[PDB]
Structure formats: C-alpha cells, structure tokens
Chain A
Amino acid sequence: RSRLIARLPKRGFNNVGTTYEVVKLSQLQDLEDTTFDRDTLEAYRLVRRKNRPVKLLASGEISRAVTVHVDAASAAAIKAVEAAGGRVVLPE
C-alpha cells in the first residue's frame, strides 16, 4: 500500500470448523438403480471425501422410496424423502 487493499476495512474472523459433503437428492433418486445408499456403498457411489460429515440436501424432485445413513440433512430434504416414502438416519 500507498493504495487500495489497505484502506479496505476489515477484521472479520476465521474459524471454519465442520463443513459437510454434498449429496443431492437428484443423485440418489431419479437416476441409477437405487443402489440403496446407507453407510458404506456411498463411498463407491462416486461421492468421496471423508475427513468430513456427509449431508443430504434437496435438489431433484421425483418419487422413489429410499433410505440413507448420513451425518445430517436438511429439513425440506427429510420432508421430500419421507413424502416419496423412505427413511433418513442420524447417529446416536
């Protein structure tokens, strides 16, 4: 700086703790065979990181009856998984 990066006003923070892997509705439902996801096959389902929790979020809208083991999910996602019929589970 004589200029324009300083003069720009921040503190903010950092943190960045737990952040989730995205598994779309449209991923499971609609396409493929219903590999019937749950706790392991998911790694071979082409959604792969670990080191993080997995979370299901609603994207695609179609009817299928499925069950899944994830670490957390979205309200509307549960709403649309049970309403096409199905189950979604959280750890105990």
Chain B
Amino acid sequence: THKMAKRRIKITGTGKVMAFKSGKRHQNTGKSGDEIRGKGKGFVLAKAEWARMKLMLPR
C-alpha cells in the first residue's frame, strides 16, 4: 500500500512493526499528563502479521 509508509508499521531489524501514540494528537486536549507528551513508539503481535503486506519490500 502507499499509505502505511508515512504512518506506523515501521519495519525493524527483527522485522517487528512500529506502533504509535494514538492517545490524542491534535484535537480534544487540555486534559492530563506526561501521558499527553507522548508521540512515541510501540508494537503488537497479531496485526504484525498482515501489516507489512502493505509496504512489503520498501520497509
């Protein structure tokens, strides 16, 4: 796919897939903590599998 590249599901040395902070980004804030201050990174197993089928070769 051509969307998923500039978004999460980045690919690593272990071919593991990189999640994000979805917690809130732009809208609906003025609420909570260090919790907010995340844009940061993450990962998961079950949708690791069919993820990189989108953006196969070019990581």
Contact = CB atoms under 8 A, between A and B. Distances in A.
Nearest to B26: A9
A4 B47 CA distance: 9
Interface stretch (A11-19, A32-40, A48-56, A81-89): A11-19
Given A5-B9, A9-B8, A14-B5, 17 more contacts: A5-B3, A5-B4, A5-B7, A5-B54, A8-B7, A8-B8, A8-B9, A8-B19, A8-B20, A9-B22, A9-B25, A10-B7, A10-B8, A10-B20, A11-B6, A13-B6, A14-B6
Q: B interface, how many residues as a size bin?
A: 10 to 19
Interface of B: 3-9, 19-22, 25, 47, 54
B contacts with A: majority SS: loop
Interface residues of A, number: 10
